[PDB]
């Protein structure tokens, strides 16, 4: 029966069964629900992969790590997820199916456990997880694991828009993954979670779709690298780059945005205003330098009291940016435009306090009362020092100059998982004079910032798994982890410029956590 296929090398099914009583679904809610609704019976009879339906057991994982977790709710099932945007509430349980059919040369155990509502999941130890209803499964198990997930609760049903907690299903590495295949230890166990609603699950109140915040689904734009723009300087993107970041500190303040659309640092939505300055200008006697008193991005007054490190779009590196100051007189429409340069490392670069200093090519021809705009163009380098040393993209300017220290900064960013490096969207700045370091890396393209901002999709976990696909060949080039904090990571060691098909796009495949093990990509 199983000769030449599985060969009795592998557990067939699990004895163990979770110690949960049966729990009623939406039937109790009928006298107090507005309506009695119906789900397409095919959805109830057929397992489909959950939005967060991928996880991995690899040798990089350590015992105690939660490899997969989810609270009970419509987001456990992609059909129910779209249906949920059309309903106000729900009640009832799920049947979850887990596939763990690892190669016969591997070893290890996973614990699945149901933790009840309002118990904190955060510090849980393997010992502690054993005290909930639980199942211990071998990483080699052949037949899918079936876990019923009842809607334990103390009310008639749940509202989509509230924060009342539900049961959480937890999968934790109970034993480290080991293997004895005698080759190279590539035998990572790729796992899939599929679900379907129990018969007692049901939606409750029909409401206008797409308007309830907590049901908007997450997506990632189909745009290509060439079609997007750098989020730290008004320039197009050119290539994808990964490299080690142990030496320096990656803490940009432009192109910083969370997956659910919260802007951070000095980040704003306009791709053109990313290194612009607007305000009134003042001559410095005897020199070609001017002092600019800052206006807001929309020509209103700037308030330093805002919980921001600087005005939105303030440059986030130390260097000399060359551009053009332009000015217009309201009465006659006279216009003047002169080459100008701002050094963000100068002690007179204090944009948090309201003033920035330019060095121009005139000591006249700039009025004191007219509005003036600095349009950035490129970066320059002092030719007498070491080549490629002046524009230090990972050095933050002192936004308050000599006074005080930088405040309310967006956090720094580093890989957290063994074997992983940041993935940078790299643009090449124009040089205007000298031998400058023209490399510019941002964490998120500006169009991704726009997309996350408008569609405020609740993050289902801390990491969105993306795969980069060549639409010509249908092939995946690499996979990467987009963290909710707004940065991307890949599995690679060393610097590398990526070889990308011109048509390549990012595709969102699954919600995962920080312990997901990425396929080795480079070379």
Strands 320-328, 94-99: pairing is: unpaired
- Any contact of residue 417 with Cl ion (CB under 5 A)? yes
* Angstrom distances, CA of residue 442 to CA of 235, 243, 274, 333: 11, 13, 12, 38
Query: How many chain residues interact with Cl ion (CB under 5 A)?
Result: 5
The answer to whether the beta carbons of residues 271 and 448 sit under 8 Å apart is: no
Query: Which segments of 218-271 are extended strands (E)?
Result: 239-242
- Any contact of residue 483 with a second copy (CB under 8 A)? no
Q: How many angstroms separate the CA atoms of 123 and 64, rounded?
A: 10
Q: Kindly indicate which of the ranges 267-275, 329-337, 444-452, 509-517 contains the residues binding Cl ion, using the contact rule CB under 5 A.
A: 509-517
Binding residues for Cl ion restricted to 454-483, rule: CB under 5 A:
none
Work out which of 293, 385, 416, 473 binds Cl ion, going by CB under 5 A. Answer: 416
First to last CA, the chain: 43
- Any contact of residue 489 with a second copy (CB under 8 A)? no
- Any contact of residue 508 with Cl ion (CB under 5 A)? no
Work out which of 96, 101, 147, 498 binds a second copy, going by CB under 8 A. Answer: 101
The CA-based angle 14-15-20, given to 5 degrees, is 105
Work out which of 245, 283, 519, 520 binds a second copy, going by CB under 8 A. Answer: 519
- Any contact of residue 331 with a second copy (CB under 8 A)? no
Binding residues for Cl ion restricted to 308-367, rule: CB under 5 A:
none
Report which DSSP code applies to 443.
Answer: S
Beta bridge partners of 321: 342, 379
Report which DSSP code applies to 178.
Answer: E
* Angstrom distances, CA of residue 153 to CA of 24, 31, 118: 10, 17, 10
Q: Kindly indicate which of the ranges 133-141, 280-288, 342-350, 486-494 contains the residues binding a second copy, using the contact rule CB under 8 A.
A: 133-141
Work out which of 469, 488, 498, 512 binds a second copy, going by CB under 8 A. Answer: 469
Using only C-alpha atoms, the chain has a radius of gyration, in whole angstroms, of: 28
Work out which of 293, 385, 473, 493 binds a second copy, going by CB under 8 A. Answer: 473
Pick the closer one to a second copy by CB: 45 or 287.
Answer: 45
- Any contact of residue 209 with a second copy (CB under 8 A)? yes
Report which DSSP code applies to 81.
Answer: H
- Any contact of residue 522 with a second copy (CB under 8 A)? no
Pick the closer one to Cl ion by CB: 334 or 416.
Answer: 416
- Any contact of residue 485 with a second copy (CB under 8 A)? no
Shortest distance, CB of residue 500 to a second copy, whole angstroms? 11
- Any contact of residue 340 with a second copy (CB under 8 A)? no
- Any contact of residue 186 with a second copy (CB under 8 A)? yes
Shortest distance, CB of residue 27 to a second copy, whole angstroms? 9
- Any contact of residue 279 with a second copy (CB under 8 A)? no
- Any contact of residue 347 with a second copy (CB under 8 A)? no
Query: Which segments of 58-161 are extended strands (E)?
Result: 66-71, 89-91, 94-99, 106-107, 109-115, 134-138, 145-149, 158-159
Pick one of Cl ion, a second copy, none as the site partner of residue 148 (Cβ within 5 to 8 A by kind): none
- Any contact of residue 102 with a second copy (CB under 8 A)? yes
Q: How many angstroms separate the CA atoms of 54 and 283, rounded?
A: 61
Contacts of 13 (CB under 8 A, 6+ apart): 141, 142, 143
Query: Which segments of 176-224 are extended strands (E)?
Result: 178-179, 189-197, 202-203
* Angstrom distances, CA of residue 420 to CA of 63, 504, 513, 516: 19, 22, 14, 11
The CA-based angle 259-262-264, given to 5 degrees, is 105
- Any contact of residue 389 with a second copy (CB under 8 A)? no
Work out which of 261, 500, 514, 522 binds Cl ion, going by CB under 5 A. Answer: 514
Pick the closer one to a second copy by CB: 291 or 509.
Answer: 509
Work out which of 229, 258, 259, 489 binds a second copy, going by CB under 8 A. Answer: 229
Binding residues for Cl ion restricted to 206-265, rule: CB under 5 A:
208-209
- Any contact of residue 157 with a second copy (CB under 8 A)? yes
Shortest distance, CB of residue 219 to Cl ion, whole angstroms? 7
- Any contact of residue 493 with a second copy (CB under 8 A)? no
Query: How many chain residues interact with a second copy (CB under 8 A)?
Result: 218
Shortest distance, CB of residue 64 to a second copy, whole angstroms? 6
- Any contact of residue 106 with a second copy (CB under 8 A)? yes
- Any contact of residue 58 with a second copy (CB under 8 A)? no
Q: Kindly indicate which of the ranges 22-30, 317-325, 387-395, 409-417 contains the residues binding Cl ion, using the contact rule CB under 5 A.
A: 409-417
Burial 414-440 (b: 16+ CB within 10 A, else e): ebebeebbbbbbbbebebbebbbbbeb
Structure tokens at 375: 């349009």
Binding site for Cl ion (CB under 5 A): 208-209, 416-417, 514
């Amino acid at each position: 029966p199983s000769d030449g296929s599985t060969a009795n090398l592998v557990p067939e099914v699990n004895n163990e069964v979770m110690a949960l009583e049966p729990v009623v679904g939406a039937a109790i809610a009928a006298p107090v629900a507005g309506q009695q609704n119906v789900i397409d019976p095919w959805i109830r009879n057929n397992f489909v992969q959950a939005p967060g339906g991928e996880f991995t057991v690899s040798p990089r994982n350590a015992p105690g790590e939660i490899l997969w977790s989810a609270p009970l709710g419509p987001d456990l099932n992609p059909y129910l997820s779209h249906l949920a945007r059309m309903y106000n509430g729900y009640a009832g349980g799920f049947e979850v199916q887990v596939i763990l059919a690892g190669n016969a040369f591997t070893a290890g155990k996973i614990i699945f456990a149901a933790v009840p509502p309002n118990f904190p999941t955060e510090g849980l130890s393997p010992s502690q997880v054993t005290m909930f209803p639980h199942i211990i499964v071998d990483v080699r198990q052949l037949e899918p694991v079936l876990i019923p997930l009842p809607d334990v609760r103390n009310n008639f049903y749940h509202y989509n828009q509230s924060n009342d907690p539900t049961i959480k299903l937890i999968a934790m590495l109970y034993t480290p993954l080991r293997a004895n295949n005698a080759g190279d230890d590539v035998f990572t166990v790729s796992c899939r979670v599929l679900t379907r609603p129990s018969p007692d699950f049901d939606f409750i109140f029909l409401v206008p779709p797409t308007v309830e915040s907590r049901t908007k689904p997450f997506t990632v734009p189909i745009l290509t690298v060439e079609e997007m723009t750098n989020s730290r300087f008004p320039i197009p993107l050119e290539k994808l780059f990964t490299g080690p970041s142990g030496a320096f500190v990656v803490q940009p303040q432009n192109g910083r945005c969370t997956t659910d659309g919260v802007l951070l640092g000095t980040t704003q939505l306009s791709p053109v205003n990313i290194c612009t300055f607007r305000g009134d200008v003042t001559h410095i006697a005897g020199t070609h330098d001017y002092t600019m008193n800052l206006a807001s991005q929309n020509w209103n007054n700037y308030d330093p009291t805002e919980e921001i490190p600087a005005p939105l779009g303030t440059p986030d590196f130390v260097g000399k940016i060359q551009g053009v100051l332009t000015q217009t007189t309201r009465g006659d429409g006279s216009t003047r435009g002169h080459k100008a340069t701002v050094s963000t490392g100068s002690v007179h670069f204090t944009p948090k306090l309201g003033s920035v200093q330019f060095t121009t090519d005139t000591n006249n021809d700039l009025e004191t009362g007219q509005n003036t705009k600095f349009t950035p163009v490129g970066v320059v380098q002092d030719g007498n020092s070491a080549h490629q040393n002046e524009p230090q993209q990972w050095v933050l300017p002192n936004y308050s100059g000599r006074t005080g220290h930088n405040v309310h900064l967006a956090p720094a960013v580093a890989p957290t998982f063994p074997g992983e490096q940041l993935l940078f969207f790299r643009s090449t700045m124009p040089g205007c004079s000298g031998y400058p370091n023209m490399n510019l890396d941002c964490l998120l393209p500006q169009e991704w910032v726009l997309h996350f901002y408008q569609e405020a999709a609740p993050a289902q976990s801390d990491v969105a798994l993306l795969r980069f696909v060549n639409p010509d060949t249908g092939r995946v080039l690499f996979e990467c982890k987009l963290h909710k904090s707004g940065y991307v990571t890949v599995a690679h060691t060393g610097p590398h410029d990526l070889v990308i098909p011109p048509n390549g796009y990012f595709r969102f495949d699954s919600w995962v956590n920080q312990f997901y093990t990425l396929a080795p990509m480079g070379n």
